[model samples]
Target: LAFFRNMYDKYRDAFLSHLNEYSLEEEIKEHISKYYKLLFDYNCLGGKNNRGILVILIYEYVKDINSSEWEKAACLAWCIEILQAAFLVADDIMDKGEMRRNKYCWYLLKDVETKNAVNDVLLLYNSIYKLIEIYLRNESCYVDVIATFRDATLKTIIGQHLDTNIFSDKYSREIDVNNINVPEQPVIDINMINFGVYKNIVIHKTAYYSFFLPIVCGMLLAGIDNLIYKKIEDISMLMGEYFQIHDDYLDIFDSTKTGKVSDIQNNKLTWPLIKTFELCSEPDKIKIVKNYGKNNLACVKVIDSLYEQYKIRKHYESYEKAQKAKILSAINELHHEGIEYVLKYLLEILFT
Candidate 1:
């Protein structure tokens, strides 16, 4: 963790120096650098750094490396961190999030508003490649590394689109674009709220980038190319589902603990909502359809009350236990001792 965290400045400065070298006035360059420095710091820091740490842990476990090789590994780790920052900045805007990492979302800041926030996310996304180019351009894995990031990000984008639109009016019925001003009312789509659709969204949105990408980054850098990647991908999907379910569970039951607004008012398809729907009475289902997506406090309270009534917390606990055992069993199947050890350790400390 310390190596990855400490090496962030080297990559940040590498990108900034490129901007500084542009054929522009000195003051403009300084201003740009000043703003960008804060952008990287604010968006990239404060989180658990789990993704970056995953890269480091995987790379170390996969093969032996000295200081020079560590530099390249660390660069990839920070690139993933930057990718996460980019995703989160855009996610908060799309989700209409109020806070993230215990502070106001970047898009909501007075100086950074939605417009700049949109452009900045692109910059953040592109910066990953530039950083990789600066550091690992000559390495044999250069193109493969870039392609890995590209594919994972593409999958994540598709996942995000599905997650955002699964319950949208377009999916339920064709929108009459002729009536642009007459927005469709928001409500939970009972048919689309099942776990099957949920897994599609979770695996794409959270799994590839969060699990597969980082693990692959480590493996590729360590030069491990074999059939095990297929197995790793499968395990990644399962981990992603388990993690996202926990996130959905927390958004309702422990919003303050997560430092974000509850998902109830966001019109989101979440685990608790699905579990509640499955276990609830027919009349209770009607109540859910009525109150699920509303922004009103009373409406949110109704869903909250329903979650409590259905014992969603206990359900989540049982799910967590079962999921942990499943992941452990899958890990045991991976005969690669070093990588398997890292996976087991990550699982044990995941929610800590």
Candidate 2:
């Protein structure tokens, strides 16, 4: 826990320093510095720090203090924090989010004072590239690290494209609320195929960028071989997907605990919601489609009831349990000290 706490503090400071270095040269015509500072503050401090925690845990697992590996581990973990900063900036732009972490989003706040919000996001993106370059300079794995970063960035944008397409489609809006009809077998099969594609997209967008990339970067720095790297990659990707699916379940069902509004309001098709659509009768499907993006509390309650009726929560729980078992088994197969145990503990906190 001390290591993790220290890593977090270091990453937080590094993130702020990067932001300041970038913003210093540009003259502030208005309160632009404040706006950029606000974004820096929210992203650096906002989320649960799950990805950062994972990177540190993986580092502890693979590296020893006596081996002069601490600096490398710390640098790799900082890369994760930097990558997240880039992603969050872009995400806030896309989501048109007004507030994050109980404060106005940078773009939203800055857009009011000046129209430089887009440029601000780009600046942050450039900062990410700069941070990576600084960390990997003269390192043997520099090229591989850059490639990994590029690949993750591309996948996330592609996933964003898919999401935009889905949101814009008329079919997505035509869902009925009162009729209850079962989808045809062929349609179900087609949806299943689409589900696989969607799941892969999710893995690339949410799992790799958010979870696996950081740890993999650390492993690359540590000189882990292809076989062991692949093993950890497999485990991390699966765990990442499970973590995302659990988030979907929590979004709709655990509003009291999570304090987050349902993703249904955004017309987001999360795993549990998709599964509910597949398993529920036609009438219930209509209700889901009708209330997909509504803000009505009654609609949310109806959706929750439908989820219960279809046992969506149970399905998610069972899937989570099976994935945990598989992850534990895979951990046992790995020879690295403390890696599996640390990962197990991380997952318990994340899932529970």
Candidate 3:
């Protein structure tokens, strides 16, 4: 909440200043205000924020806290936040999400008052690029930073495209387990598909931008060595994946705590849920297939029962244990005192 509140205050100030500098007319000013307020409400409210926080965490870990480079770290941190805001705005539109952080989504709110919601979203998108350009111009390694930013954007779009393709008619046959040709089988079981595709998506969409991109930029700005920067990326990506998996679990089992309903009803495959599907018996599979993606309460009831029968809750507990163990072992391999402490703090956030 504190992070989001700060973001809202800063963005509000930036938007108003931009308007005044342009000498916009009254009618235009009203529309800008509405768009800004809608952005403030929606981006501030929804989703797990571990990715954005991890960018800052990794930066602070690798850089000397007392050094002049801390200022650069701060700038990079806000850059990550702005990047997150851009991603969330697009994600909400893709998910067809209605309520976010207990309020109407920015797009829906704009649609309620007028028909130009797409225009509002486009303004927010343009503002993201503008902020990135502003930061790049002020920094010494402008070209490097711009490349990292563009790479992150491209990776996310590729992941989104892959995710969209996975559910489309063209990919449906590939998703079926029985269609496998034994000698030439691609090991495309549910778990393999879920892990392979989703891991790539999480690494690009969440891990790269949210975890290591900012820290790498910070390291470059601070004149750090390739070895040290690589260490930051390797460790942070593991931690980021751990965080995302916990989120997938929380989406289904901790609905009240998470603020949104389970994506299970949306037919979205998550790790633990996919594991359950992989282990269920023939009858259980039928039960799941019948009620997999429906939103009705009765269908929800069937899902709840299937979860119990397959002991999915217990499977998730085991998965969490194994994931944490792997993360701890990786953290132990890092030789840097600062990086180790930072990884420890991140681990505590995700597990404790």
Best by lDDT: 1
Clashes of 2: 7
Q: Order the candidates by TM-score, highest first.
A: 1, 3, 2
Q: What's the lDDT for all of these models? A: 0.90, 0.64, 0.61
Pairs with steric clashes in candidate 3: none
lDDT of 2 by residue, 23-86 (tens): 4446652355566565555566656666767766766667546433565556566556656766
TM-score of each: 0.97, 0.77, 0.79
> Candidate 3, 194: how far from true, in Å?
4.9
lDDT for model 3, please: 0.61
Candidates 2 and 3 compared: the better one by lDDT is 2
- Please give, for residues 1-352, the per-residue lDDT of candidate 3 as tens digits: 1243245455445645575566779888888777667664556445455444555555565653543444344445555565676665566677666655555655566454334444555565566556555444666676777677778778778866664444444454345567556433111224334576677766665667766675566556554546666666777677667767777776667434555444655556567656766688878777666775666788778877777777777887787789788878877886777767766766777533
* Model 3, C-alpha of 331: deviation from truth (Å): 2.3
On TM-score, the stronger of 1 and 3 is 1
Sliding window of 10 residues with minimal summed lDDT for model 2: 184-193
Show where candidate 3 strays beyond 4 Å. 1-8, 45-53, 64-72, 110-122, 173-194
Indicate the residue-level lDDT of 317 in model 1.
91
Per-residue CA lDDT of model 1 for 1-90, tens digit only, reads 455788888899999998898999888988999999999999999888888889999998887467999999999999999999999999
